[PDB]
Amino acid sequence: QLLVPPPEALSKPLSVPTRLLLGPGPSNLAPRVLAAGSLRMIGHMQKEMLQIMEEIKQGIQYVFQTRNPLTLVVSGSGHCAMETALFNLLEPGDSFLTGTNGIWGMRAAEIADRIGARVHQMIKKPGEHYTLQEVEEGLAQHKPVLLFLVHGESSTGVVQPLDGFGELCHRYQCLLLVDSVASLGGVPIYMDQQGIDIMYSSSQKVLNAPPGISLISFNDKAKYKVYSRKTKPVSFYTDITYLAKLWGCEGETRVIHHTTPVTSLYCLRESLALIAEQGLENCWRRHREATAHLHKHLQEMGLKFFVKDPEIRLPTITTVTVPAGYNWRDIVSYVLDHFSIEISGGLGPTEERVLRIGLLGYNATTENVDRVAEALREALQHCPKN
Amino acid sequence: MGSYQLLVPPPEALSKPLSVPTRLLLGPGPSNLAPRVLAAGSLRMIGHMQKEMLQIMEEIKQGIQYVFQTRNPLTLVVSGSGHCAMETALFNLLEPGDSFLTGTNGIWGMRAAEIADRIGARVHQMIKKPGEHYTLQEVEEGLAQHKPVLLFLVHGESSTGVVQPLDGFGELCHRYQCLLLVDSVASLGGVPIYMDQQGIDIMYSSSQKVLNAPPGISLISFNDKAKYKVYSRKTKPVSFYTDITYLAKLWGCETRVIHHTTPVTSLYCLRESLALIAEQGLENCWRRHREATAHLHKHLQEMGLKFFVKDPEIRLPTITTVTVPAGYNWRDIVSYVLDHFSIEISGGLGPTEERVLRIGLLGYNATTENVDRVAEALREALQHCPKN
Ligand SMILES: [Cl-]
Ligand SMILES: [Cl-]
């Protein structure tokens, strides 16, 4: 008799409800992504898989607007890629500076502390962005080798201006790493033209692919920092010298490394195809249009924006101050139960303070906005008020 | 819409429809997907912390407890692949200066030693020739010599086709105040393993071998003794996103906490894989693997091919290493099987590179028909590939 019996809970079929996902992520899957969902497996090193990897690389290069050959997929999620960037770029004792204007800069600082960097932070109140003058003051004070800046701050609903920051860093012999997990595909970014040295994003926000994989690109200046290291990075399986060879970024010959997530790659390939077919300008315009419609409905319902400066409101994820007198969990639950729409509360410094509404890629439509606006109106008239 | 003009154009290659060929994957991994797992790949998305996802996660935990044969509450999925889980184990279990002992009998022990060296452990290796396993006596001599806090042992050595006996190793380790960490990536579901009963403190496996799930996620379990080593560290582990103290809370192993976005689709696939094993039952799954392998071995012997592993009792049921026949170019054989029969097999890995062919019979694929298919392909490759 075996110690542990077959779990009764697994004896029933798997079913998932049909919902409209308008939170900060994951987003709903695009039809072409859904169609790729039941493709068969092939060997991860076979010629057809190497071709899919090359197409993905080309797609990443297009969406990032980079020619960097060290552009690839990291086999992990949400912000994970963040560890790949920091483990490779930072050595013990290196001066590291973060734009801590929300949960993401704080998390980067935590990761850098774990690997022994000398971590410095420009701390700003949630809802705020960094000016060039503020960044210059941090660079001059801390003399960092790397600056971490968040483009789309999903915890606070802030979009950071990017023009000029990379060249400012280069004047201080500092590299610029940008997080565009919540912004890529929805907000203009020109990695090379803006002087961004390292950038990462994820599959499950604007790209409408399943969560679990991430996108990263390092320029040759960043690669030079990695090759100048005294020691190997702490992780073998995110070591960019190994990943570069796996992904064919150093010419013809590969190296055996890990088993890549083949079905996730199929989905990402389709997601990138969709963006390439629509074109970035049209993608950027659709997000601006969807968000403008949402902001009009929010103002009409009497909801207030967490971000006071309209010019720094992130198009893709909007932070709404919880309405006075209501329990925000009642609002979220009402929308879920009566309309089958997912929205969220806050994150990090905005926990208990806001609602977050995401309009991401395939989901950034005025029709979806109309649906969540109706749900919120009904929640406001029925949820208990004090 | 922004401050610059787009200078990188849309890639034309992406406009072509994505299709993949239909092949039988009989290599060391990844395996073909079970029908319910293929179907799970097209399920819709839901929020990763919604009630339905938390239920799926609870069912997956129970499934992992079943296949590992453990009652350990600290049992969860690591959101990464192949032998990724290996880093999670080592980053959490080893502090700088900790004595670490590895069973280096193939590529996996070599890899564990390299990862441990990167994080500052005092690494000691028990080096054995590829194709051999460890005796209790050899392990005791290493424990006595090096006084490790942790021993790493590979159950299914996929680079050499070896299955390591596990009875007595945990108890031995515990007599030396050492924790036992086992890699069952290539053996779980195909070879008997009883985690608690065999005194294994930490164990990990992956989704893409016997489980017939897509690559990308791994399974790990830590017992109370291992949990004590982790929760008693002096410094934080190097990775926040594989820190077990945080993953334990995400997975409800204690209150719950926000951490990373879980791979929802991979979890759907894994739930279905675990459901299939639970329906079939472990004993039946072990039997079908022994039965398929016996049939393959009968075919290989009859066609003149020699086993890389000399002792039959040490031959891993799931992945067989065949010595490359004299006079042939192994690449020709592998390409012949692919081109003429649409079957994937492989060559070697690490210390067996250029030395062997590897044939995997994993879960759904461990069938008589599949063995007969690959045997036919191999007989024809031997007839038609150039031989010196
Ligand atoms: Cl969906
Ligand atoms: Cl398949």
GROMACS .gro file of C-alpha atoms in nm, chain A:
model
  386
    1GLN     CA    1   0.000   0.000   0.000
    2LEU     CA    2   0.154   0.332  -0.114
    3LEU     CA    3   0.202   0.612   0.143
    4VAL     CA    4   0.006   0.873  -0.060
    5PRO     CA    5  -0.314   0.778  -0.253
    6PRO     CA    6  -0.423   0.929  -0.594
    7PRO     CA    7  -0.578   1.274  -0.511
    8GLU     CA    8  -0.957   1.267  -0.558
    9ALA     CA    9  -0.939   1.638  -0.654
   10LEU     CA   10  -0.760   1.544  -0.982
   11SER     CA   11  -1.034   1.294  -1.093
   12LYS     CA   12  -1.262   1.562  -1.243
   13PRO     CA   13  -1.201   1.747  -1.573
   14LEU     CA   14  -1.011   2.070  -1.588
   15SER     CA   15  -1.224   2.372  -1.680
   16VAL     CA   16  -1.152   2.744  -1.660
   17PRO     CA   17  -1.413   3.022  -1.669
   18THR     CA   18  -1.444   3.263  -1.963
   19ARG     CA   19  -1.352   3.613  -1.845
   20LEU     CA   20  -1.236   3.951  -1.969
   21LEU     CA   21  -0.904   4.019  -1.797
   22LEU     CA   22  -0.869   4.399  -1.750
   23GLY     CA   23  -0.627   4.399  -1.461
   24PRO     CA   24  -0.254   4.471  -1.476
   25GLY     CA   25  -0.186   4.120  -1.617
   26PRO     CA   26  -0.215   3.850  -1.740
   27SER     CA   27  -0.412   3.973  -2.037
   28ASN     CA   28  -0.645   3.769  -2.255
   29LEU     CA   29  -0.480   3.572  -2.535
   30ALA     CA   30  -0.507   3.689  -2.893
   31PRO     CA   31  -0.679   3.446  -3.135
   32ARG     CA   32  -0.353   3.366  -3.324
   33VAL     CA   33  -0.196   3.291  -2.982
   34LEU     CA   34  -0.491   3.070  -2.885
   35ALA     CA   35  -0.453   2.887  -3.222
   36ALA     CA   36  -0.085   2.813  -3.139
   37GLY     CA   37  -0.187   2.668  -2.802
   38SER     CA   38  -0.239   2.311  -2.917
   39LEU     CA   39   0.054   2.278  -3.157
   40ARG     CA   40   0.255   1.959  -3.111
   41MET     CA   41   0.600   1.932  -2.961
   42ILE     CA   42   0.926   1.904  -3.157
   43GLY     CA   43   1.281   1.873  -3.018
   44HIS     CA   44   1.411   2.198  -2.877
   45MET     CA   45   1.739   2.181  -3.081
   46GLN     CA   46   1.579   2.068  -3.416
   47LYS     CA   47   1.609   2.288  -3.728
   48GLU     CA   48   1.247   2.404  -3.721
   49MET     CA   49   1.283   2.515  -3.359
   50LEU     CA   50   1.608   2.702  -3.442
   51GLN     CA   51   1.410   2.881  -3.724
   52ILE     CA   52   1.129   2.975  -3.478
   53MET     CA   53   1.398   3.111  -3.237
   54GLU     CA   54   1.547   3.322  -3.520
   55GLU     CA   55   1.199   3.459  -3.612
   56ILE     CA   56   1.134   3.538  -3.242
   57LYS     CA   57   1.465   3.722  -3.220
   58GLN     CA   58   1.370   3.928  -3.528
   59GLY     CA   59   1.027   4.001  -3.369
   60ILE     CA   60   1.191   4.115  -3.041
   61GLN     CA   61   1.432   4.337  -3.238
   62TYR     CA   62   1.131   4.495  -3.410
   63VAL     CA   63   0.919   4.552  -3.098
   64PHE     CA   64   1.217   4.686  -2.895
   65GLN     CA   65   1.346   4.884  -3.199
   66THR     CA   66   1.695   4.745  -3.167
   67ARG     CA   67   1.958   4.586  -3.391
   68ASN     CA   68   2.133   4.425  -3.090
   69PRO     CA   69   2.230   4.065  -3.175
   70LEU     CA   70   2.219   3.969  -2.799
   71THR     CA   71   1.838   3.972  -2.793
   72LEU     CA   72   1.662   3.658  -2.666
   73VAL     CA   73   1.397   3.497  -2.449
   74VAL     CA   74   1.449   3.426  -2.082
   75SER     CA   75   1.275   3.108  -1.969
   76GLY     CA   76   1.092   3.275  -1.673
   77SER     CA   77   0.838   3.543  -1.588
   78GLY     CA   78   0.669   3.845  -1.456
   79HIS     CA   79   0.971   4.062  -1.395
   80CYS     CA   80   1.231   3.756  -1.355
   81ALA     CA   81   1.445   3.879  -1.652
   82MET     CA   82   1.525   4.147  -1.389
   83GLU     CA   83   1.747   3.891  -1.212
   84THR     CA   84   1.908   3.790  -1.545
   85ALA     CA   85   1.999   4.155  -1.607
   86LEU     CA   86   2.134   4.223  -1.257
   87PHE     CA   87   2.316   3.891  -1.203
   88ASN     CA   88   2.508   3.949  -1.526
   89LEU     CA   89   2.571   4.325  -1.506
   90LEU     CA   90   2.658   4.367  -1.138
   91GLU     CA   91   2.962   4.233  -0.949
   92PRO     CA   92   3.001   4.246  -0.573
   93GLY     CA   93   3.085   4.602  -0.477
   94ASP     CA   94   2.959   4.765  -0.795
   95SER     CA   95   2.774   5.092  -0.745
   96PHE     CA   96   2.408   5.048  -0.860
   97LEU     CA   97   2.141   5.318  -0.874
   98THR     CA   98   1.764   5.267  -0.893
   99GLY     CA   99   1.469   5.486  -0.973
  100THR     CA  100   1.260   5.375  -0.674
  101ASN     CA  101   0.925   5.540  -0.746
  102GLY     CA  102   0.725   5.226  -0.675
  103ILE     CA  103   0.755   4.857  -0.607
  104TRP     CA  104   0.981   4.776  -0.909
  105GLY     CA  105   1.284   4.991  -0.825
  106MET     CA  106   1.262   4.863  -0.467
  107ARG     CA  107   1.263   4.499  -0.598
  108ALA     CA  108   1.565   4.571  -0.818
  109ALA     CA  109   1.746   4.715  -0.519
  110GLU     CA  110   1.664   4.401  -0.319
  111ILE     CA  111   1.803   4.173  -0.589
  112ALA     CA  112   2.122   4.382  -0.620
  113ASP     CA  113   2.168   4.376  -0.242
  114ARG     CA  114   2.146   3.990  -0.249
  115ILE     CA  115   2.436   3.971  -0.496
  116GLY     CA  116   2.654   4.219  -0.305
  117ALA     CA  117   2.621   4.543  -0.502
  118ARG     CA  118   2.653   4.882  -0.332
  119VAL     CA  119   2.290   4.982  -0.379
  120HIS     CA  120   2.180   5.344  -0.404
  121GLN     CA  121   1.828   5.466  -0.458
  122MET     CA  122   1.654   5.777  -0.579
  123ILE     CA  123   1.333   5.751  -0.377
  124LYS     CA  124   1.026   5.939  -0.496
  125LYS     CA  125   0.665   5.931  -0.385
  126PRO     CA  126   0.435   5.682  -0.566
  127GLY     CA  127   0.271   5.857  -0.860
  128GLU     CA  128   0.582   6.054  -0.952
  129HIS     CA  129   0.842   6.022  -1.234
  130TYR     CA  130   1.214   6.123  -1.260
  131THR     CA  131   1.338   6.432  -1.439
  132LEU     CA  132   1.679   6.446  -1.614
  133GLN     CA  133   1.799   6.684  -1.338
  134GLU     CA  134   1.706   6.436  -1.061
  135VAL     CA  135   1.879   6.151  -1.243
  136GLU     CA  136   2.192   6.365  -1.301
  137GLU     CA  137   2.205   6.443  -0.926
  138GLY     CA  138   2.192   6.068  -0.841
  139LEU     CA  139   2.462   5.980  -1.098
  140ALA     CA  140   2.699   6.253  -0.974
  141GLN     CA  141   2.644   6.153  -0.609
  142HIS     CA  142   2.669   5.772  -0.637
  143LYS     CA  143   2.885   5.720  -0.944
  144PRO     CA  144   2.700   5.402  -1.048
  145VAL     CA  145   2.800   5.151  -1.315
  146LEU     CA  146   2.430   5.083  -1.387
  147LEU     CA  147   2.105   5.278  -1.353
  148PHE     CA  148   1.770   5.093  -1.334
  149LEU     CA  149   1.471   5.297  -1.460
  150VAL     CA  150   1.109   5.165  -1.485
  151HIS     CA  151   0.927   5.273  -1.805
  152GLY     CA  152   0.577   5.153  -1.708
  153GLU     CA  153   0.538   5.152  -1.329
  154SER     CA  154   0.252   4.900  -1.295
  155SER     CA  155   0.225   4.957  -0.915
  156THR     CA  156   0.161   5.333  -0.947
  157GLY     CA  157   0.024   5.375  -1.305
  158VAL     CA  158   0.314   5.603  -1.411
  159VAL     CA  159   0.489   5.632  -1.750
  160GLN     CA  160   0.848   5.755  -1.734
  161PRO     CA  161   0.981   5.985  -2.008
  162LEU     CA  162   1.284   5.816  -2.171
  163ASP     CA  163   1.436   6.079  -2.406
  164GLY     CA  164   1.785   6.184  -2.292
  165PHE     CA  165   1.830   5.948  -2.000
  166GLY     CA  166   2.064   5.698  -2.170
  167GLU     CA  167   2.303   5.966  -2.296
  168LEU     CA  168   2.300   6.129  -1.956
  169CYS     CA  169   2.408   5.796  -1.807
  170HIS     CA  170   2.686   5.753  -2.066
  171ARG     CA  171   2.836   6.092  -1.963
  172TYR     CA  172   2.881   5.938  -1.615
  173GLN     CA  173   3.020   5.606  -1.757
  174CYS     CA  174   2.691   5.442  -1.649
  175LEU     CA  175   2.476   5.192  -1.838
  176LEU     CA  176   2.095   5.233  -1.863
  177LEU     CA  177   1.869   4.931  -1.791
  178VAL     CA  178   1.499   4.984  -1.854
  179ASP     CA  179   1.204   4.774  -1.740
  180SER     CA  180   0.929   4.781  -2.008
  181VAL     CA  181   0.724   4.488  -1.886
  182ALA     CA  182   0.406   4.699  -1.860
  183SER     CA  183   0.476   4.940  -2.146
  184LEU     CA  184   0.624   4.750  -2.440
  185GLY     CA  185   0.387   4.745  -2.737
  186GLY     CA  186   0.161   5.012  -2.581
  187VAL     CA  187   0.389   5.308  -2.531
  188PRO     CA  188   0.659   5.443  -2.771
  189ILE     CA  189   1.015   5.305  -2.698
  190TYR     CA  190   1.308   5.317  -2.942
  191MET     CA  191   1.577   5.119  -2.760
  192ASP     CA  192   1.875   5.209  -2.978
  193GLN     CA  193   1.769   5.567  -3.064
  194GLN     CA  194   1.709   5.646  -2.694
  195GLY     CA  195   2.051   5.516  -2.584
  196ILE     CA  196   1.902   5.231  -2.371
  197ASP     CA  197   2.172   4.968  -2.311
  198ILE     CA  198   1.967   4.685  -2.158
  199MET     CA  199   1.589   4.635  -2.171
  200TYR     CA  200   1.347   4.359  -2.074
  201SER     CA  201   0.972   4.296  -2.098
  202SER     CA  202   0.730   4.001  -2.050
  203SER     CA  203   0.491   3.792  -2.259
  204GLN     CA  204   0.165   3.842  -2.065
  205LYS     CA  205   0.094   4.213  -2.072
  206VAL     CA  206   0.054   4.398  -2.408
  207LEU     CA  207   0.188   4.095  -2.601
  208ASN     CA  208  -0.116   3.876  -2.501
  209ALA     CA  209   0.088   3.555  -2.467
  210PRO     CA  210   0.075   3.320  -2.172
  211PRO     CA  211   0.288   3.422  -1.868
  212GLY     CA  212   0.617   3.246  -1.801
  213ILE     CA  213   0.868   3.385  -2.049
  214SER     CA  214   1.041   3.721  -2.086
  215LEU     CA  215   1.224   3.923  -2.349
  216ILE     CA  216   1.568   4.076  -2.301
  217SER     CA  217   1.822   4.266  -2.507
  218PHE     CA  218   2.180   4.376  -2.423
  219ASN     CA  219   2.387   4.603  -2.644
  220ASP     CA  220   2.760   4.551  -2.699
  221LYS     CA  221   2.848   4.814  -2.433
  222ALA     CA  222   2.650   4.607  -2.179
  223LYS     CA  223   2.812   4.289  -2.313
  224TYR     CA  224   3.154   4.456  -2.256
  225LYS     CA  225   3.059   4.512  -1.888
  226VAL     CA  226   2.970   4.139  -1.857
  227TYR     CA  227   3.303   4.029  -2.018
  228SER     CA  228   3.502   4.261  -1.794
  229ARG     CA  229   3.380   4.072  -1.481
  230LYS     CA  230   3.630   3.926  -1.228
  231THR     CA  231   3.395   3.634  -1.149
  232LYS     CA  232   3.125   3.426  -1.317
  233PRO     CA  233   2.765   3.531  -1.239
  234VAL     CA  234   2.590   3.338  -0.965
  235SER     CA  235   2.347   3.157  -1.192
  236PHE     CA  236   2.458   2.922  -1.466
  237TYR     CA  237   2.113   2.906  -1.628
  238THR     CA  238   2.074   3.285  -1.662
  239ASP     CA  239   2.443   3.343  -1.744
  240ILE     CA  240   2.420   3.558  -2.057
  241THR     CA  241   2.737   3.396  -2.202
  242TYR     CA  242   2.550   3.063  -2.208
  243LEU     CA  243   2.213   3.206  -2.319
  244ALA     CA  244   2.380   3.396  -2.606
  245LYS     CA  245   2.522   3.070  -2.749
  246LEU     CA  246   2.190   2.881  -2.698
  247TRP     CA  247   2.003   3.157  -2.886
  248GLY     CA  248   2.256   3.184  -3.177
  249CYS     CA  249   2.372   3.536  -3.087
  250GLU     CA  250   2.744   3.456  -3.136
  251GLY     CA  251   2.745   3.324  -3.492
  252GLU     CA  252   2.686   2.968  -3.616
  253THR     CA  253   2.769   2.726  -3.328
  254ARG     CA  254   2.534   2.667  -3.031
  255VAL     CA  255   2.587   2.510  -2.685
  256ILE     CA  256   2.369   2.252  -2.502
  257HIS     CA  257   2.222   2.441  -2.203
  258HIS     CA  258   1.858   2.401  -2.076
  259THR     CA  259   1.539   2.267  -2.239
  260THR     CA  260   1.358   2.573  -2.375
  261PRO     CA  261   0.982   2.619  -2.325
  262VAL     CA  262   0.880   2.512  -2.676
  263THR     CA  263   0.503   2.577  -2.655
  264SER     CA  264   0.560   2.917  -2.489
  265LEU     CA  265   0.790   3.002  -2.784
  266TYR     CA  266   0.518   2.912  -3.033
  267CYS     CA  267   0.279   3.155  -2.856
  268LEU     CA  268   0.537   3.434  -2.836
  269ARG     CA  269   0.616   3.394  -3.206
  270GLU     CA  270   0.248   3.453  -3.288
  271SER     CA  271   0.224   3.750  -3.045
  272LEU     CA  272   0.523   3.912  -3.213
  273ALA     CA  273   0.372   3.839  -3.557
  274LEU     CA  274   0.058   4.027  -3.460
  275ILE     CA  275   0.250   4.336  -3.354
  276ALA     CA  276   0.462   4.324  -3.672
  277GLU     CA  277   0.147   4.302  -3.891
  278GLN     CA  278  -0.033   4.590  -3.715
  279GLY     CA  279   0.283   4.794  -3.689
  280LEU     CA  280   0.403   4.973  -3.370
  281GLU     CA  281   0.254   5.311  -3.466
  282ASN     CA  282  -0.096   5.158  -3.492
  283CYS     CA  283  -0.040   4.965  -3.166
  284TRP     CA  284   0.063   5.284  -2.988
  285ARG     CA  285  -0.232   5.474  -3.128
  286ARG     CA  286  -0.485   5.202  -3.026
  287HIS     CA  287  -0.363   5.210  -2.664
  288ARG     CA  288  -0.379   5.592  -2.648
  289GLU     CA  289  -0.735   5.580  -2.791
  290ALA     CA  290  -0.856   5.302  -2.553
  291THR     CA  291  -0.709   5.479  -2.252
  292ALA     CA  292  -0.860   5.818  -2.351
  293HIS     CA  293  -1.206   5.650  -2.363
  294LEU     CA  294  -1.148   5.489  -2.022
  295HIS     CA  295  -1.032   5.820  -1.872
  296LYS     CA  296  -1.347   5.997  -2.004
  297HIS     CA  297  -1.572   5.728  -1.839
  298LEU     CA  298  -1.377   5.743  -1.512
  299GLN     CA  299  -1.411   6.126  -1.496
  300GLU     CA  300  -1.785   6.102  -1.584
  301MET     CA  301  -1.846   5.846  -1.299
  302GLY     CA  302  -1.663   6.081  -1.057
  303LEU     CA  303  -1.360   5.856  -0.998
  304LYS     CA  304  -1.027   6.027  -0.934
  305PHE     CA  305  -0.684   5.946  -1.077
  306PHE     CA  306  -0.404   5.837  -0.843
  307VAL     CA  307  -0.148   6.002  -1.079
  308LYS     CA  308  -0.214   6.378  -1.058
  309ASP     CA  309  -0.013   6.485  -1.365
  310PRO     CA  310  -0.208   6.357  -1.669
  311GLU     CA  311   0.115   6.366  -1.877
  312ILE     CA  312   0.269   6.080  -1.676
  313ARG     CA  313  -0.038   5.851  -1.668
  314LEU     CA  314   0.063   5.510  -1.813
  315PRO     CA  315  -0.172   5.427  -2.101
  316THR     CA  316  -0.167   5.054  -2.033
  317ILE     CA  317  -0.240   5.040  -1.657
  318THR     CA  318  -0.448   5.313  -1.490
  319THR     CA  319  -0.445   5.368  -1.113
  320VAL     CA  320  -0.785   5.490  -0.982
  321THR     CA  321  -0.810   5.620  -0.625
  322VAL     CA  322  -1.049   5.392  -0.433
  323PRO     CA  323  -1.381   5.586  -0.407
  324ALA     CA  324  -1.443   5.733  -0.057
  325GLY     CA  325  -1.699   5.536   0.145
  326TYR     CA  326  -1.667   5.195  -0.032
  327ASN     CA  327  -1.467   4.880   0.048
  328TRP     CA  328  -1.255   4.838  -0.268
  329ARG     CA  329  -1.277   4.452  -0.240
  330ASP     CA  330  -1.656   4.479  -0.278
  331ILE     CA  331  -1.610   4.682  -0.601
  332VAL     CA  332  -1.360   4.427  -0.745
  333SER     CA  333  -1.582   4.128  -0.643
  334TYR     CA  334  -1.899   4.288  -0.784
  335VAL     CA  335  -1.731   4.346  -1.121
  336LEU     CA  336  -1.606   3.984  -1.123
  337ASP     CA  337  -1.931   3.820  -1.008
  338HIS     CA  338  -2.188   4.020  -1.206
  339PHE     CA  339  -1.984   4.101  -1.525
  340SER     CA  340  -1.706   3.834  -1.544
  341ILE     CA  341  -1.442   4.107  -1.573
  342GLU     CA  342  -1.122   4.095  -1.372
  343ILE     CA  343  -0.979   4.426  -1.237
  344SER     CA  344  -0.734   4.462  -0.944
  345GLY     CA  345  -0.652   4.653  -0.630
  346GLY     CA  346  -0.306   4.802  -0.571
  347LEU     CA  347   0.046   4.676  -0.543
  348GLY     CA  348   0.332   4.765  -0.312
  349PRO     CA  349   0.287   5.131  -0.210
  350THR     CA  350  -0.062   5.149  -0.367
  351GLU     CA  351  -0.194   4.843  -0.175
  352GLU     CA  352  -0.542   4.934  -0.031
  353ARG     CA  353  -0.528   5.275  -0.204
  354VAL     CA  354  -0.626   5.214  -0.567
  355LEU     CA  355  -0.801   5.006  -0.830
  356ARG     CA  356  -0.591   4.911  -1.134
  357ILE     CA  357  -0.744   4.875  -1.481
  358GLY     CA  358  -0.526   4.738  -1.762
  359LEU     CA  359  -0.591   4.790  -2.136
  360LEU     CA  360  -0.333   4.560  -2.293
  361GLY     CA  361  -0.286   4.480  -2.665
  362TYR     CA  362  -0.581   4.275  -2.795
  363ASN     CA  363  -0.775   4.402  -2.489
  364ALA     CA  364  -0.721   4.776  -2.557
  365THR     CA  365  -1.053   4.838  -2.724
  366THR     CA  366  -1.325   5.095  -2.666
  367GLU     CA  367  -1.580   4.804  -2.649
  368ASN     CA  368  -1.392   4.654  -2.352
  369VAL     CA  369  -1.377   4.999  -2.187
  370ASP     CA  370  -1.753   5.032  -2.229
  371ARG     CA  371  -1.794   4.692  -2.056
  372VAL     CA  372  -1.576   4.776  -1.752
  373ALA     CA  373  -1.731   5.129  -1.725
  374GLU     CA  374  -2.082   4.970  -1.709
  375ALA     CA  375  -1.959   4.721  -1.446
  376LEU     CA  376  -1.805   5.000  -1.232
  377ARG     CA  377  -2.118   5.221  -1.260
  378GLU     CA  378  -2.331   4.929  -1.136
  379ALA     CA  379  -2.082   4.847  -0.855
  380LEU     CA  380  -2.094   5.213  -0.738
  381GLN     CA  381  -2.475   5.212  -0.723
  382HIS     CA  382  -2.500   4.869  -0.540
  383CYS     CA  383  -2.187   4.812  -0.327
  384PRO     CA  384  -2.225   4.915   0.043
  385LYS     CA  385  -2.122   5.280   0.109
  386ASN     CA  386  -2.034   5.453   0.441
   0.00000   0.00000   0.00000
